[PDB]
Design a protein around this nucleic acid. Structure first.
Ligand SMILES: [N+]
Lengths: 152, 70, 71
DNA sequence: GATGTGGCGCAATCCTTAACGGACTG
DNA sequence: CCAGTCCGTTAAGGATTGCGCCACAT
């Protein structure tokens, strides 16, 4: 973006959109100098839009993601998000890779797993993604977390 | 914050329960640990006794052995 | 049937409050001491077990020399 | 009588972990 | 910018704890 968006701009755009709509971005950018019509819709569509649910996932939502991925596979996230009102691709992808994918196991942390980790982190460092390469059913997020508060 | 706010009521109920849980658990640990000390204490006595027996017996035999006529 | 604004109540409360602090620290202290004793005993018992085994070994060995006596 | 204990509800604090917000790659 | 991936950092909430009133045991 041009510069950092202020509380005013954010507000001023929110009010502007309310009146004019989601289509008139050429006018709305007239009220917000230093902001091209493109940046305006992106600041709103991808942030300010009050319909962007960012809370917890109901069993409903979770189940729907399962089906779609079940059938079409873990990809085309943006398209899958069209089936989850309020959510966007990125969320759907993460939710699935971290809590929905069967392979991910909820099992407790064993001494071996805890070892290969203490082991590898000393070697590879904070390469969570890589460390997970050596864990049958652990996402980099789990491992990363585990360490962060466990291995102080 | 105002304590009449339904937000408060729930928050408290939520923590109360969480409290009774931590405490109910700590008591469980403290108790189970107490048993292990009892058990291990019994055991220790049992083992120290057997060690007394064998040791005595061994000693007593070694004797009868070196005392053998020939 | 008593007054909670009393100045005597105030002192009784402080007496007890101090007492509760004592009881809880003590407990916290004991529970600690126990937890340590549980470890050392576990250590000790492992040690004794070995002695018993070693002793039962030396005993059998000896028991045999006896039977293997020329007679 | 007096002091010790075990419950309980607050309310400040700590810890765990989902998933947010940047930064990067093709 | 898009569509995927990574990763550091947050933050909503449960998990702990210390505090003081209280009923009841030693
Ligand atoms: N959506």
């Amino acid at each position: 973006g041009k510069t950092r968006w202020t509380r005013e701009e954010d507000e001023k755009l929110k009010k502007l959109v309310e009146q004019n709509g989601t289509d008139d971005w050429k006018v709305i950018a007239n009220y917000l100098p230093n902001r091209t019509d493109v940046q305006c819709q992106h600041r709103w569509q991808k942030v300010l839009n009050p319909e962007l649910i960012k809370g917890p996932w109901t069993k409903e939502e979770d189940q729907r993601v399962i089906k779609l991925v079940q059938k079409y596979g873990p990809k085309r996230w943006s398209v899958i998000a069209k089936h989850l009102k309020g959510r966007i691709g990125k969320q759907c992808r993460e939710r699935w890779h971290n809590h929905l994918n069967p392979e991910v196991k909820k099992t407790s942390w064993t001494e071996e797993e805890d070892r290969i980790i203490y082991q590898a982190h000393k070697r590879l460092g904070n390469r969570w993604a890589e460390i997970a390469k050596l864990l049958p059913g652990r996402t980099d997020n789990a491992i990363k977390n585990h360490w962060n508060s466990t291995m102080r | 914050v105002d304590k009449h706010s339904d937000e408060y009521k729930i928050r408290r109920e939520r923590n109360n329960i969480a409290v009774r849980k931590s405490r109910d658990k700590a008591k469980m640990r403290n108790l189970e640990t107490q048993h292990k000390v009892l058990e291990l204490t019994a055991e220790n006595e049992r083992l120290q006794k057997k060690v007394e027996q064998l040791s005595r017996e061994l000693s007593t035999l070694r004797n009868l052995f070196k005392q053998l006529p020939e």
